[PDB]
Design a protein. Sequence first.
Lengths: 347, 347
Amino acid sequence: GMQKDSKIYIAGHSGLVGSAILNELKQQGYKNLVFKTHFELDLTNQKAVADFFEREKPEYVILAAAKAGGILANNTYRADFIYQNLMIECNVIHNAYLHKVKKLLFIASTTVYPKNATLPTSEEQMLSGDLEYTNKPYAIAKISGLMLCESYNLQYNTNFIAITPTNLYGNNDKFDLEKSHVLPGILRKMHLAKLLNEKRYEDLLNDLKFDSIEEAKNYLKKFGVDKDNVEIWGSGKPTREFLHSQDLANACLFIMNNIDFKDLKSIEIINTHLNIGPHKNITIKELAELIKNIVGFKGKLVFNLNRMQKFTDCSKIHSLGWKHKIELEDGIKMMYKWYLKEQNIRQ
Amino acid sequence: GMQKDSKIYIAGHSGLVGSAILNELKQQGYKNLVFKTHFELDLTNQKAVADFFEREKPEYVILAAAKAGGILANNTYRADFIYQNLMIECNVIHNAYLHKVKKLLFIASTTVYPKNATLPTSEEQMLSGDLEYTNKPYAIAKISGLMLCESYNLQYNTNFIAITPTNLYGNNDKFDLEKSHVLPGILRKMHLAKLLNEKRYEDLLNDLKFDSIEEAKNYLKKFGVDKDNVEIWGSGKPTREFLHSQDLANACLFIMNNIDFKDLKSIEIINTHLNIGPHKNITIKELAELIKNIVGFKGKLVFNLNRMQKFTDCSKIHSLGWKHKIELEDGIKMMYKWYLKEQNIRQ
């Protein structure tokens, strides 16, 4: 296991992942922590990474740094998304072998899996079919990162662990109704409909930063919200899944302390990465119901037939002694409570 | 097109591929050629590649350099085979964009295709299923190289062409009966059986570097050869395919001069690489017959039931105006004639 005084380099420490991880390292008593901003350490620069590892000699590495973005960025910056990730991956993973790092964790995602994979999707389904177009270059870079870890382990007996977490959520989500994910977007829509339904107009104005009630009402029509109704686009049959960032961070710690390459072999050794997730999925419609209940919205949900399936199999991490602890309803209450506190609105 | 005085950097110029290409560049009148040995330019070294491109400013790049080896090396050196190729690929492809290279060609292989792909295997079958274990890390590195080329083209309007040639053969094959491919191995076995069958013992001794006839005969039993018989292992039902290195080199030239990224697009742009091959496959048994006839062995072929399918679709390169010119029987006669000249044995 890692000692409390072990020197642990966390690369990509500022993202949602890196942050959650730094926090959990602090929670568990780890003091001897190193990390650098981009401004301070270009991880695509071979010489800079080698000079960092020379000067610092980290015992443990957690590689959460990636060039990542939304659907649009992935589809625009296709060269940057494959080249930078390939370079970050190769420089950090190679130098760690060279500098005799005791254990490395590489954080990828379920982006590595085929778009039409069968559910539930075990690690054994990697490469069994083609990838989604829009993130194809990032996804290949991540598959390469997996293969780097497994390759170094098989050739050089390193202990480089790769994980593929599912879709994440936290209290650090964005509730911008223009740019936000399905969960925080429905949560805020549902809250706004409650405010209209209960005629809590001070809260409504404050939430939206409007100063005319009538303009607030007009504006919420764009999102399918009025005082009796919240509109969800589609039938609500697509599934999603959610892993809370604190559960991801806990599983990172558990892996570093309790799961080594030897636990993940079985004579052709493949798919020695680990899915991390709740081993559970949910329909948009069910999700919308849960959020309706948590928010306490009393009006109607409408699924408008004018306009994907996901289930990551986490059996293997379960058989190695880790299960997520935050169930979806609890994670959504916690998010809503942070949200209300930041909007200065009461339940 | 490339001008005769255009500066053309050929990376990996000493391998079977690089060599064939340098030769064909000479044949077509290209004088202004640059290339470096490893000893002179470590292509995994980011700074060295950037300093090379700074000092030389090549107009055209042909990237044939790879860490490659046989079945054993691929399965031993798994980390070196993914890491070095990823690094060679990223450094050369990125620097070429940075240094405004006019056109780049990246040479991969049919290693990118699924092990159970349906025949004939078009470029559209890339990633439709899992890869062979033994070369999995090299193959992922090559898929990454494809995605690098296509990504730079889509994001930055570069003209980086990737090709996936099928299995190669030439006059530079090895006829070591211990380590050789199916084609040169059967050709030499068949020749040795002819020599025994026709009692051409001076030739037989000379071919094997033996000096006892009886020891020569004992030794050829290890390979399934006597004066009446040549043994082929298996039923002879597996298929192979063959592209002559000179045809590959010609197609490289044709691509550089006549096929640009815009010819290879059709709104989700994928699989803009090009298969290169004869658009033809052959069974081991048929191959053995052809070689028997060419050699003029008069005895029997025996397929010993004590102990794979391949067909690369080259429609797309055909529809762009290039077809291989060396049919298998001609390529095998040429190899045999070089072989006999190097062994100083007559037909």
